[PDB]
Ligand binder design. Structure first.
Ligand SMILES: [Fe+3]
Lengths: 166, 294, 314, 146, 145, 166, 314, 47
C-alpha cells in the first residue's frame, strides 16, 4: 500500500559542510542486507556466535543535462571518496514534537561500483552500487529546502493562447 | 604601531616576570613571578622600577596573571591559588607585604561553580568586566583540540553571585602550544589581545589580537622588542603578561607588554608600550629613572 | 587497540602517532616440560614443568595522505617500537564497536574527520579507548616485514615477546591498594573488595604474632625477580627470629642478635638488618605468596609488619 | 591553468626550494589575474549583469529592476493625458521632488526642497563648527584644574 | 578551513604536511572565489541591491532605485494628482520662502539656488581652511623655526 | 533528459601525432568503474584503507565498408598497442572563455578484447572491451574539424526530377 | 622506486639502466636475544638482546624490445648489483601515483614514450622521483633467480642484507648540519630546527666547562664502528683531564701531562694526543650518544670543542 | 604581490621566516578579496 515514488534519496560528501543533494530520475532501487553467520557447532549441539554483515544499496538513474551529480558519483568510485547517504521516506513524518522531520535510514560508505549504458536514440542511464560501512542508523530526518521545492515538481501549469504566454 | 620603551623593573628576586600590571590611580606596578615550587612572588614597585615591597603567596601556583580591581578606593586582587595540593581556587584578597596563603586571610568567590578546573582572571574597569581564562582537562582537550577558553562576565554579577557566561570562546592549540605558550592576555573594546612567546630567539614571539564577539582572528603581527634586530642580551627573550593602561583622566588606553631578557641566572624585565598619543610619555614621566646621583 | 608502551624514560601510544591497529593477540606462556622416560615402564617421570615466554603479536597498519610519507611513517614505527630496551607494554581495548550516530542533513550537523582521513565516530569524551586492565608486560620486539597494500595503506606484523618472566605484572604496588591515593591501575580482573582498611586489602599490621594475607594474584609470587618486599619493625628484642608461612617455606634468622626497635627490610632472597650492610647468611630461604589466603606466623609479636608486592598473572 | 604542486619533496634540496618558488609564482599570477578580473567586472566590464540579477525594494514592494522597467514602460504607454490648459500638465509634473511624494502645489514643493537643503547644510556647518572646537580643545588642552 | 601561518620550527612531517595543506587550500579557496564571482556575474539572482547601481545623466549622479521611484511618482502624480489654476500656481510660486515676492519664477529659482550654492561654498572654504590648518599644525615641518 | 546520440567517441594511437578518429556506427556503449575495497577491519571496529579500480569501457559497432578503423582496433588488441580514447559529450560546451571545447572523459589503455559476429543477410557487427590505465581525467576538449563535419550528417537533400539531378 | 647504489668508486641507479622496480620493502633488524632459563623458576633471565641484520628485499623487472636482449640486460643487472663489495644503498620513492594528463586529440599534443616502450607520465621537471630520505644502508647482495614471464618482461627478486651494523646510517656528517654548505642530505624524518647557529644544530662550542648536545638520531651512537669523532682544543694546561657525559660513561686521561693549546682528536675508542702517535692507554672508555639531550661536563673550560658524527636509525 | 620569489637556498630559519611571511601575505590577500567581493555584492555604493 506504498508507492515507491514516495521514498527519496539524499546524498552528501562527508567532509563537506553543505546540505544534502537529492538523486533525480532513479528508476530502480534496491537495498540488500546480507549476513554471514559466524556459527560454531559443537559435536553435541549447535550455536551461532556472531554475524558479519555485507549491506549495500543499488540504484539506477537517467543522466539529465541539468545536474552534474553523476559525475560526482563517478569521481567517488574512481577516487574512493567517502559519502554519507540516506533514504528519507516522504509521507511518514515525526510523531512527538516532530512534523517536518521524516523517517529515514542513514548510512555511509564508499561507492564500490558505477557503470553507465546507452543505446541508439535512447536516454543514457546508469547503475551504481554503494557499500555500507557497518550498521546503518535510523532516525527522523528533516529535508533541506532545495529538496522540498523539488518534491513538488508541478508540470506545465495552465498557459494561454494567442500570444498571452509561450 | 611599533612598541616604545618605558622602563625596566627591579624586583629583588631572580626569576621570570610571569606577568605585570600597573595601576592608574596610584602609579604602582605589581609584577608576578613564579618561585621554585608552586609558590609565587608578587612585587610592588614604583614606575621607574624601584622596589617598594613584596608578597609571597605560598602554594599559589605559577601566578601567570592576576586581576586588580578597584572598588571605591579598595584594591582587590583576584588570583589563582591552590591549598594543600587539593585543587585550583579562584580567590580574592588585599595586598599586604610579607607572606600569605589560602585560609582565613583569603576569601574565595563562588567556589562551587568554577573550582572544577584551573582558572585565572583579568579586570577591565572601563566596561567593568572580569575576563576569566579557564583551562581544560586532558580528556576534554582530546576532543576540543585546545587548552583553554576565555569567558566574559560582569564584576557586579560576580559580586552579587549571579553567574553569566556571555562571550565564551575557545583558543586553538597553535596559539597556546609548547612553542607558543600563553604568556599573556588582556581584553579591550571587544578585542582580546593574546601575547605569546617561546623564550627562544628566532622563534618569533608575538601577539595574536582577535575578537571575542564573533570568534575570528583580527590581526597577528611580529614583536622584536628585546632590543636590536635578532641580537638580544643573553641568549633568549621571552614574552610576558599584558596590561591595558587606562587613565582616570584623558581616557587614552595604551597596551603595555612585558619582555624578559638575558642569560640563565640573570634576568632583565622591560616594559614596552603601544600608546595613544601621550600615554607612554606620561607613564615614563611620572617619576624619573634612578641614577647614581641627582 | 592502541598498544601502549612505557619505555625507560617515556610513554608512547601508537594511535596517537597515526598508527591504527587491527587487534592484539596474546599467547599464553610456553610451558617447557622436563620429563624423563624410564626405560621399560609405561609412564615417564616429571622432573619439572615451567613457564617460559608469553609471545605477543600485534598487526598494525597505517594510512597517510601521500605515498612518499609512507617511508617516514614506517621509519617512525621502527624508531618508536623496535627496542631491545625492555619496555612495559599495556594493552588497550574498546568498550563497544562504535558507529557513526544519527545526524541531520540540513547543511548542519556535518560529520568530522580525524587527522587521518577517517570518520570520527568518537563524538563524546566517553567514546575513546581505555586501559582495559591494570597490568603490563615486560616486552621486547622481534622481526617485522612491511607489505604495502595499495595506496597509502601499509600493514606491519609486530611480534613481541616477554623479557624476564612470563607473567602479567600488575602495575602499582600493594600499598597503593592500601592507601587509596593513586587512581587507575586497579581493574576488576582483580577481585578486590571495596572495604579499604578491611581485610584482604591491608598489608600493614601491628602488634601480632600471626596474621592473614590475601594475595589476589592467581600466579604465585615465589620468583625473586618479582618485587616482593617486606619490612618489619620487630617489636621485641631477641637473639633468634623465626617466622613461618604457608604456601612457602620456614624462615629463620639465627646466629645474629637483634633488638626490638631495629627494623628488617626483607627483600627477595635478601636481608637488610638495618636497611644497609646486608646480613643474609642466616637461612637463605625466600617466601612465596601463591594466591588468596597466605597466613603468616611470627613468634614474638612484631610491633609492625608491612609489605608491598606486585601481583602476577597467568 | 597548470595547477599547483600540492606534493613536495621529502628532503631539503634545491628541488624543494624550487617547488615552493614555482608554487608561489603561480599563486602570485593567479591572485593578480583574479584581482584584475574583479576590477574589470567592477569598473570596465559592460553587460555584466542582465538586470534580473538586481533587487529593487520600496514600500515593501520587492521586484527586479528589469521587470520594473517593463512595468514602467507599460504604464507609460498606457498613460492618458488631456490638454487641460497651457501648462497644467507641465506644472503637475513638476509638483514632485525627485523621490515621489507628490506635493499639492509647486510652491509647497519648492518650500520643502529649500527647507531640506537649508536644514542639511546648516546641520553640516554645525557639525563642522563643533568638530573644529573639539579639535582645538584637544590640541590646546590647558586645563590645570584637572 | 584556514591557512596555517604558524609553521613548525623543526622541519618534520608536520611541517611538510602543513605546507602541502597550505598550497592545497590556496588552490581550493582561489578556484572557489573564481567560481563565486562567475556565479555572481552570470546567475546570482539579486546579486546587487538597487540602491547601489549608478545612473549617470549629464552632470548628474543618482542610483537606479531612487530614479525608478521618481519615475513612478511622476506617473502617479500626473495620473491621480489633482490639477487646475496653473497660472495662479506659478504666480504664487514666484514668492520665496522668506516673504519676498520675486518678479518671475525662474529668477526666484535662480536666487534660491545661488543662495544655497554660496552658503555651501562658504562652508566648504571654511572646511578646507580648517583642514589645512590642522595639517600644518600636525605634520608641521618648518626648519626655518 | 539526454539522448545518447549526443555523446561522441574519439580515438587515437598514443605515439601518433595526428588528430583523433571518431568511431562511427556504434550501437551500444558502456563504461563500468568497478572498485576493490582494500579494507582492513579491526577486531573492535572497521576501516577502509584504499581501493584498486578496474575501470573499462565496452562498445559495439557495425563495420561499414568506408572506414578501416575496426582493423586498427583489432591490430591493437592482438599487438597490444596503447590507445588513448575520450568520450566528448556534444551539446555541453565550455563555460568560461570556452565555446568550441566540449565536456569529456579522457582515458588511456589497451584494448583487452575485440570480437565480431555476423549472420546471414545481416550486417556484420562487433564488440570491443577496452581497459583503462588507472584513473581517467576529465576536462573540456575541442573536436577536430573532421569530426565536426561528420557530426552534421545531413541526408539526401532535395534533388530534382526529370534528369535535373541524380 | 629506483634503488640507488653508491659503490666504492661510482654511483648507479637502476631505472637509468632500463630497470623499473615494483617496490622496496625493508625489514626491521633481527633482534638476537640471549636469554638464560633458570632451572625451576617461572621466568628466564635476560643476558642480552642485540640488533643484528636489516634484510632488504627489492623485486625488479625489466622490459626490452626483443627477446635476445633479455640476456644482455640480465647480465648487466648481475654485473651492476651482485657485489660483495659493501655498497651504500639509498632508497627512493615517488611523491604521487602519477597519471597521464589531459591532452587534445587534434593531431597535436600527442603523447611521449620512454626509451622503454612505456607512456611518459613525467611531463614536468617536478614529476620524477626523489631521495625520500637523507640516509643510506651498508649493504650486500644475496642469491637471485630470474623467472621470465612472457615477451620481453622478466622479473628478479633481489635480497639485500646489511653489512656491518643494522642501522640507517645518515649520510653527511653533523658539521654539514653546522655549516649549511652541502644541500640535500637532510630530510624531515630528522626533526631538525631551522635555527642554524641556534641550539640543537651546533656541535662547535668555545670556552665552556659544560654544554649541551642534541643527538637527533633515535638509535644510539655507542658503537665504535659509527663515525663518532671528536676534536678538542683543551684551553687550559693540566696534568690530568676528566670529562663526564650522560647516556654514557665517565672518561679520564690520567698519567700523561698535556698543555693548553695542544689538541686531542678523540676518535672512537681511540685518542690522538696531538693528531698522531696515539696515547690511548688512559681509561679506555668510549662515549655514547643516545638521543636528544646529551649533556657533557668537562673540568677546566676547554677553549674549543667540536665533534662530527653520524646519525643512525632503527 | 610583494612575495619573495628568491628564497634562501640554505637550511636556515630565514627560509621559514620568509615562507611564513609569504603565507601571511597570501592569507591577508585572500581575506581582503573575499571582503571586497562581499562589499561589492551587498554593501558597496555605486558598485
Ligand atoms: Fe557585480
Amino acid at each position: 500500500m506504498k508507492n515507491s515514488n514516495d521514498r527519496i534519496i539524499l546524498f552528501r560528501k562527508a567532509g563537506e559542510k553543505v546540505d544534502a543533494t537529492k538523486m533525480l530520475f532513479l528508476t530502480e532501487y534496491g537495498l540488500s542486507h546480507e549476513a554471514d553467520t559466524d556459527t560454531e557447532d559443537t559435536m553435541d549441539g549447535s550455536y551461532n556466535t556472531g554475524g558479519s554483515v555485507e549491506s549495500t544499496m543499488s540504484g539506477t538513474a537517467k543522466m539529465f543535462y541539468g545536474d552534474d551529480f553523476a559525475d560526482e558519483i563517478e569521481d567517488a568510485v574512481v577516487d574512493r571518496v567517502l559519502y554519507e547517504a540516506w533514504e528519507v521516506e516522504s509521507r511518514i513524518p515525526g510523531k512527538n514534537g516532530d512534523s517536518a522531520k521524516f523517517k529515514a535510514k542513514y548510512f555511509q560508505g564508499f561507492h564500490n561500483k558505477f557503470e553507465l549504458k546507452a543505446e541508439a536514440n535512447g536516454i543514457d542511464e546508469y547503475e551504481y552500487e554503494y557499500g555500507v560501512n557497518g550498521r546503518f542508523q535510523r532516525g527522523f530526518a528533516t529535508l533541506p529546502e532545495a529538496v522540498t521545492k523539488k518534491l513538488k515538481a508541478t508540470g506545465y501549469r495552465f498557459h494561454d493562447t494567442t500570444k498571452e504566454d509561450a | 604601531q611599533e612598541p616604545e620603551f618605558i622602563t625596566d623593573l627591579s624586583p629583588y628576586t631572580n626569576a621570570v616576570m610571569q606577568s605585570f600590571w600597573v595601576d592608574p590611580r596610584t602609579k604602582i606596578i605589581y609584577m608576578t613571578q613564579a618561585r621554585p615550587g608552586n609558590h609565587y612572588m608578587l612585587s610592588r614597585l614604583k614606575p621607574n622600577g624601584q622596589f617598594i615591597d613584596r608578597l609571597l603567596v605560598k602554594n599559589g601556583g605559577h601566578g601567570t596573571h592576576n586581576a586588580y580591581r578597584y572598588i571605591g578606593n579598595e584594591l582587590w586582587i583576584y588570583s589563582a591559588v591552590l591549598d594543600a595540593n587539593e585543587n585550583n581556587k579562584f580567590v580574592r584578597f588585599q595586598y599586604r607585604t610579607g607572606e600569605i596563603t589560602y585560609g582565613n586571610e583569603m576569601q574565595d568567590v563562588m567556589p562551587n561553580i568554577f573550582n572544577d578546573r584551573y582558572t585565572s582572571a583579568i579586570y577591565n574597569p572601563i566596561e567593568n568586566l572580569m575576563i576569566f581564562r579557564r583551562e581544560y582537562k586532558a580528556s576534554e582537550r582530546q576532543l576540543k583540540n585546545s587548552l583553554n577558553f576565555v569567558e566574559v562576565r560582569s564584576a557586579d554579577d560576580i559580586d552579587k553571585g549571579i553567574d553569566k557566561v556571555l562571550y565564551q570562546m575557545d583558543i586553538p592549540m597553535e596559539y597556546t602550544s609548547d612553542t607558543q605558550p600563553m604568556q599573556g592576555i588582556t581584553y579591550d573594546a571587544g578585542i582580546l589581545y593574546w601575547y605569546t612567546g617561546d623564550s627562544k630567539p628566532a622563534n618569533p614571539n608575538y601577539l595574536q589580537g582577535f575578537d571575542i564577539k564573533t570568534k575570528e582572528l583580527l590581526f597577528k603581527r611580529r614583536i622584536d622588542i628585546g632590543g636590536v634586530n635578532n641580537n638580544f642580551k643573553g641568549d633568549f627573550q621571552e614574552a610576558e603578561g599584558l596590561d591595558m593602561y587606562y587613565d582616570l583622566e584623558t581616557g587614552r588606553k595604551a597596551l603595555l607588554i612585558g619582555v624578559t631578557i638575558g642569560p640563565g641566572n640573570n634576568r632583565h624585565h622591560s616594559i614596552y608600550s603601544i600608546g595613544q598619543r601621550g600615554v607612554n610619555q606620561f607613564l615614563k614621566n611620572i617619576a624619573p629613572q634612578v641614577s647614581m646621583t641627582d | 587497540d592502541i598498544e601502549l608502551t612505557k619505555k625507560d624514560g617515556t610513554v608512547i601510544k601508537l594511535s596517537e602517532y597515526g598508527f591504527i591497529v587491527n587487534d592484539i593477540v596474546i599467547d599464553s606462556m610456553q610451558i617447557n616440560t622436563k620429563y624423563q622416560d624410564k626405560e621399560n615402564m609405561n609412564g615417564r617421570i616429571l622432573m619439572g614443568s615451567n613457564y617460559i615466554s608469553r609471545d605477543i603479536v600485534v598487526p598494525c597498519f597505517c594510512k597517510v595522505k601521500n605515498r612518499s610519507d609512507i617511508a617516514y611513517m614506517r621509519d617512525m614505527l621502527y624508531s618508536l617500537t623496535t627496542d631491545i630496551e625492555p619496555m612495559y607494554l599495556r594493552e588497550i581495548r574498546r568498550k563497544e564497536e562504535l558507529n557513526y550516530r544519527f545526524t541531520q542533513p540540513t547543511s548542519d550537523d556535518y560529520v568530522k574527520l580525524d587527522k587521518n582521513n577517517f570518520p570520527d565516530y568518537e563524538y563524546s569524551r566517553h567514546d575513546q579507548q581505555i586501559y582495559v586492565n591494570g597490568k603490563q608486560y615486560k616486552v621486547i620486539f622481534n622481526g617485522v616485514i612491511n607489505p604495502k597494500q595499495k595506496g597509502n595503506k601499509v600493514s606491519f606484523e609486530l611480534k613481541f615477546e616477554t623479557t624476564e618472566l612470563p607473567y602479567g605484572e600488575s602495575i602499582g604496588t600493594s600499598l597503593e591498594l592500601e592507601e587509596n591515593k593513586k587512581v587507575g591501575l586497579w581493574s576488576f580482573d582483580f577481585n578486590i573488595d571495596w572495604h579499604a582498611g578491611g581485610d584482604k586489602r591491608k598489608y600493614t599490621f601491628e602488634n601480632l604474632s600471626k596474621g592473614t594475607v590475601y594475595y589476589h594474584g592467581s600466579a604465585p609470587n615465589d620468583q625473586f625477580n618479582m618485587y616482593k618486599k617486606i619490612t618489619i619493625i620487630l617489636g621485641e628484642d631477641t637473639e633468634s627470629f623465626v617466622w613461618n608461612l604457608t604456601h612457602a617455606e620456614i624462615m629463620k634468622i639465627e646466629g645474629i642478635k637483634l633488638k626490638a626497635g631495629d627494623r628488617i627490610v626483607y627483600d627477595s632472597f635478601r636481608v637488610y638488618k638495618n636497611g644497609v650492610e646486608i646480613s643474609t647468611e642466616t637461612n637463605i630461604s625466600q617466601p612465596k605468596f601463591k594466591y588468596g589466603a597466605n597466613k603468616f606466623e611470627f613468634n614474638q609479636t612484631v610491633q609492625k609488619v608491612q609489605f608491598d608486592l606486585k601481583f602476577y598473572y597467568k | 591553468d597548470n595547477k599547483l604542486i600540492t606534493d613536495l619533496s621529502r628532503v631539503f634540496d634545491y628541488r624543494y626550494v624550487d617547488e615552493n618558488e614555482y608554487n608561489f609564482k603561480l599563486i602570485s599570477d593567479m591572485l593578480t589575474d583574479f584581482n584584475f578580473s574583479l576590477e574589470y567586472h567592477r569598473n570596465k566590464e559592460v553587460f555584466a549583469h542582465n538586470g534580473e540579477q538586481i533587487k529593487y525594494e520600496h514600500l515593501n514592494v520587492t521586484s527586479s529592476v528589469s521587470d520594473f522597467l517593463t512595468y514602467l514602460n507599460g504604464r507609460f504607454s498606457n498613460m492618458v493625458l488631456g490638454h487641460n490648459g497651457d501648462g497644467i500638465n507641465e506644472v503637475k509634473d513638476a509638483r514632485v521632488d525627485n523621490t515621489g511624494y507628490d506635493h499639492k502645489t509647486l510652491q509647497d514643493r519648492l518650500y520643502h526642497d529649500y527647507s531640506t537643503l537649508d536644514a542639511f547644510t546648516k546641520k553640516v556647518e554645525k557639525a563642522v563648527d563643533e568638530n573644529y572646537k573639539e579639535y582645538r580643545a584637544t590640541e590646546y588642552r590647558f586645563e590645570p584644574k584637572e
